[PDB]
Amino acid sequence: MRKFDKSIAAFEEAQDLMPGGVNSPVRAFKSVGMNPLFMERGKGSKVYDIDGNEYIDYVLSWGPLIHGHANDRVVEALKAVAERGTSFGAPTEIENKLAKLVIERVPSIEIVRMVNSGTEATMSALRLARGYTGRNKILKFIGCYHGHGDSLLIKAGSGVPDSPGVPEGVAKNTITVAYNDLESVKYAFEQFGDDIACVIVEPVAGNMGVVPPQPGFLEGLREVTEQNGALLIFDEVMTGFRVAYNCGQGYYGVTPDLTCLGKVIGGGLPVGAYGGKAEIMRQVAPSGPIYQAGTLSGNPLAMAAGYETLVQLTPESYVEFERKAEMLEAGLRKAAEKHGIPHHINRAGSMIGIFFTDEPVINYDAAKSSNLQFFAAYYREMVEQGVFLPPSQFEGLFLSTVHSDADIEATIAAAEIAMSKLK
Amino acid sequence: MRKFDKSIAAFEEAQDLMPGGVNSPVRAFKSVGMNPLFMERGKGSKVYDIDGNEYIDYVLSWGPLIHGHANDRVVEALKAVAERGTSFGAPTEIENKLAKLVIERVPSIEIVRMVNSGTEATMSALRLARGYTGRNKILKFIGCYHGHGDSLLIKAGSGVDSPGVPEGVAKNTITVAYNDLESVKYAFEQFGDDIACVIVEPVAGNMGVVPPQPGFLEGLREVTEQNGALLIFDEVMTGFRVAYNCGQGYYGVTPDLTCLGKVIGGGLPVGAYGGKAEIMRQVAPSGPIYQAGTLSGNPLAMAAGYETLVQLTPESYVEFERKAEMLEAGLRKAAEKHGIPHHINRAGSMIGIFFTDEPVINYDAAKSSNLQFFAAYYREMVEQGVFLPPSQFEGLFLSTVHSDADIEATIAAAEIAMSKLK
Numbered sequence A: 001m002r003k004f005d006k007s008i009a010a011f012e013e014a015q016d017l018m019p020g021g022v023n024s025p026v027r028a029f030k031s032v033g034m035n036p037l038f039m040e041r042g043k044g045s046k047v048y049d050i051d052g053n054e055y056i057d058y059v060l061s062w063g064p065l066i067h068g069h070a071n072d073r074v075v076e077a078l079k080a081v082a083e084r085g086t087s088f089g090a091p092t093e094i095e096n097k098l099a100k101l102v103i104e105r106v107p108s109i110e111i112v113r114m115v116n117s118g119t120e121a122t123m124s125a126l127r128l129a130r131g132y133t134g135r136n137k138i139l140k141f142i143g144c145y146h147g148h149g150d151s152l153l154i155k156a157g158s159g160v161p162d163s164p165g166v167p168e169g170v171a172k173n174t175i176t177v178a179y180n181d182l183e184s185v186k187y188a189f190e191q192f193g194d195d196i197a198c199v200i201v202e203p204v205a206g207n208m209g210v211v212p213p214q215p216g217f218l219e220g221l222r223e224v225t226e227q228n229g230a231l232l233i234f235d236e237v238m239t240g241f242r243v244a245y246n247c248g249q250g251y252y253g254v255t256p257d258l259t260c261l262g263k264v265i266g267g268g269l270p271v272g273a274y275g276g277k278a279e280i281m282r283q284v285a286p287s288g289p290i291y292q293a294g295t296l297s298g299n300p301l302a303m304a305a306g307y308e309t310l311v312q313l314t315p316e317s318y319v320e321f322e323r324k325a326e327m328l329e330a331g332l333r334k335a336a337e338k339h340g341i342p343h344h345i346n347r348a349g350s351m352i353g354i355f356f357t358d359e360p361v362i363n364y365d366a367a368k369s370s371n372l373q374f375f376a377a378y379y380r381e382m383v384e385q386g387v388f389l390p391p392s393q394f395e396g397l398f399l400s401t402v403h404s405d406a407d408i409e410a411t412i413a414a415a416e417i418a419m420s421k422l423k
Numbered sequence B: 001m002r003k004f005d006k007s008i009a010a011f012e013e014a015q016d017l018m019p020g021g022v023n024s025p026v027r028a029f030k031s032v033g034m035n036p037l038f039m040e041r042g043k044g045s046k047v048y049d050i051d052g053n054e055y056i057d058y059v060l061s062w063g064p065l066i067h068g069h070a071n072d073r074v075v076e077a078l079k080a081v082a083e084r085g086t087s088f089g090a091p092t093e094i095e096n097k098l099a100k101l102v103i104e105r106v107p108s109i110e111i112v113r114m115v116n117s118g119t120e121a122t123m124s125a126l127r128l129a130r131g132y133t134g135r136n137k138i139l140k141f142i143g144c145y146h147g148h149g150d151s152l153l154i155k156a157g158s159g160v161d162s163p164g165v166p167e168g169v170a171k172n173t174i175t176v177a178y179n180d181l182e183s184v185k186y187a188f189e190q191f192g193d194d195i196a197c198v199i200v201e202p203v204a205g206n207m208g209v210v211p212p213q214p215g216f217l218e219g220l221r222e223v224t225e226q227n228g229a230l231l232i233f234d235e236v237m238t239g240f241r242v243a244y245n246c247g248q249g250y251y252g253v254t255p256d257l258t259c260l261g262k263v264i265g266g267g268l269p270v271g272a273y274g275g276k277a278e279i280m281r282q283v284a285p286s287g288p289i290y291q292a293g294t295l296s297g298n299p300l301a302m303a304a305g306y307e308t309l310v311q312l313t314p315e316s317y318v319e320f321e322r323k324a325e326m327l328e329a330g331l332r333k334a335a336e337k338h339g340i341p342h343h344i345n346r347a348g349s350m351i352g353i354f355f356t357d358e359p360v361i362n363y364d365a366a367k368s369s370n371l372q373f374f375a376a377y378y379r380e381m382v383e384q385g386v387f388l389p390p391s392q393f394e395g396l397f398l399s400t401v402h403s404d405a406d407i408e409a410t411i412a413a414a415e416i417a418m419s420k421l422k
């Protein structure tokens, strides 16, 4: 029987310091109605709470830890940079080294700009798209999260009416359509087409759980934007370096005008980036008039973590991710079928998510049919069995290059027990 | 004679990779017309370029490096955290430790929320003010920079109005001159029912160092209180730098919300917004105001911030003020000697020199600085081994490790640079 005494006491302290006792809303474990787990350390695919409990980690800091916790190569590079200075406020050669790697790895990126988060990357790409086209409106999808820039906080799904504090002056310039609903994007262009600066889309939706694009969706977005003079922006903050070697755009063969990156690009440190066609990126200050800056953007510590992370990813890493994701899908499918549990498993490249509904999960509306009581009961038992999954039905399982076949087998064995207690 | 050949070759490569070859506009050294210096390493108050040139550093990454480069305690704390994992996406005890220190250090902060930058801190504080008051308009000052959130990119001054910001956003931002309380009163007379907040730097730092005039900050507190608007202090630069208890503690003016950054991270990407508990309670997950961040409160950044802040004592500020007084005297002595127009501003520990005899009390007066004198002065300071901010519209940053010998060498270098202007 797992004990959470130390985590309970630390959360009593936290609640008197931060809103809801956390620095990010999902960390309060409210979706599963459990006491939040306080983490002490990690190594590879293993994470340890302050009560000394060990877990197989499928959260990986919500995506960044593609090589798990404390990867030796990343750690040594961080220690070497720290001794020489973590930030200078002037150019460094390490910034060149990561920018070159990102340009080579991401198809659409010819010129890149580093920032400190995915929120900074998407807000900057929207400003660039509006400035480049001379247009006001942006189109996004219902149930999709792109960070907390005001224009993007409209119908942002699970966890996010729409956030107060966002004026009508902002809301009026954001159009929202159901993810995977190509015809409704086409209809929006019939009304707003020459005032739409951009369409922003996740190549695989990740905030409504894992929802892959339907056939013809992404290709359709590329067609409608280019025919109407709008930019196509791929928000690859979660998908980038994770769904495939050359990202979602590489995986599906659809090339956007601009791409936003985060999460894995930092390998455990706060890093984001936006990049794309050279003629568009040239409009960003100091080369152009569209202002964006950051004090810690491109700092050597974050560039080293990001470089050491990305250089260790090869095409073979993704073949292994796909093999493990297929094994997890089969094991979860077998456990749900054995116990008569409604379930739908989505898989796109390395990404995988299980929804507690029999409905085919193709959009936010279908995702919302998930049985959240079953999710919370399944989650509670997975914690008891030593598995740390994302505490939300509206998230996929994150894999690392360090998950072993023994980890996968133990996860499936835990899921069988967890499914057996639902009904 | 100093050589910059390796920095020149590295910038040639950078220009094919990033817009303007940089990750932040100031780094391109365009205000001074020079080849950007590529930095390799630093130690204490010393910074080294890739050509092997040593500099006395007054940039300190534009504020964060209050203990200079590679402070041993900060480095040892980063190394120890890295070995155990830099980010978990679940709560940690180190986040409690830093939040507790910040709540104690910053007067107005009862509840705090960590973010990854000053830009994230200010955009969130504006959204919270609008949500809390149910109002749309924000008031900021001309020539002041609060980060790149769309609402704040109006009259943002030196380096910055940006295209890509729709009129839908612009119509909700009111801008008036810094240190002009009467225009603020007028703005409240005309639009007061719709003003969610006034955002202000306790000491302006983006138009060079411009301290507040008598009655300005108090007047902002009074006008906001009386009209139901919040008072937000942008202490991203002033926080933990101008005084032990920040700008608000130094001037004795308590805002509703405070934004932090820069020194709070000690050289790592960290920001924060905090304030009255009943306001902060409206932020998610406690309330309906949405704000989140994946790397927010990560242990590596919490450890860097904690070790940085715990090492600052009231005595650190007595020493900063002593050194800033020495710099002001020596710089003033050099300008008078060479007949150079000058105005030196000092607020707490902060210091800036303007190449104008006009009293610099706002952006319009700061704009009277002779930029050709600034660039000529700057080029000679680099030749003498001093790394200053490459802009007239920035003050000099001191660290706890700048020695008296560093200060004296800086003054002697300024004497030579002033001698070549006229």
Ligand SMILES: *Cc1c(COP(=O)(O)O)cnc(C)c1O
Pocket: A116, A117, A118, A119, A120, A122, A145, A146, A147, A148, A202, A206, A235, A236, A237, A238, A239, A262, A263, A272, B292, B293, B294, B295
């Ligand atoms: C997490 C995420 C973001 C925001 O990134 P942060 O670093 O948390 O600000 C943006 N877009 C997507 C698709 C994400 O998953």
Ligand SMILES: *Cc1c(COP(=O)(O)O)cnc(C)c1O
Pocket: A293, A294, A295, A296, B116, B117, B118, B119, B120, B122, B145, B146, B147, B148, B201, B205, B234, B235, B236, B237, B238, B261, B262, B271
């Ligand atoms: C630098 C600065 C900011 C922005 O902080 P970043 O971390 O660069 O986003 C905000 N306000 C003030 C006063 C600043 O000096």
Ligand SMILES: [Ca+2]
Pocket: A102, A103, A104, A105, A106, A107, A108, A109, A110
């Ligand atoms: Ca490319």
Ligand SMILES: [Ca+2]
Pocket: A277
């Ligand atoms: Ca082209």
Ligand SMILES: [Ca+2]
Pocket: A293, A294, A295, B024, B025, B026, B062
């Ligand atoms: Ca900057």
Ligand SMILES: [Ca+2]
Pocket: B102, B103, B104, B105, B106, B107, B108, B109, B110
């Ligand atoms: Ca306080």
Ligand SMILES: [Ca+2]
Pocket: B276
């Ligand atoms: Ca009170």
Ligand SMILES: [Cl-]
Pocket: A142, A143, A178, A179, A363, A364, A365
């Ligand atoms: Cl939907």
Ligand SMILES: [Cl-]
Pocket: B142, B143, B177, B178, B362, B363, B364
């Ligand atoms: Cl002015």
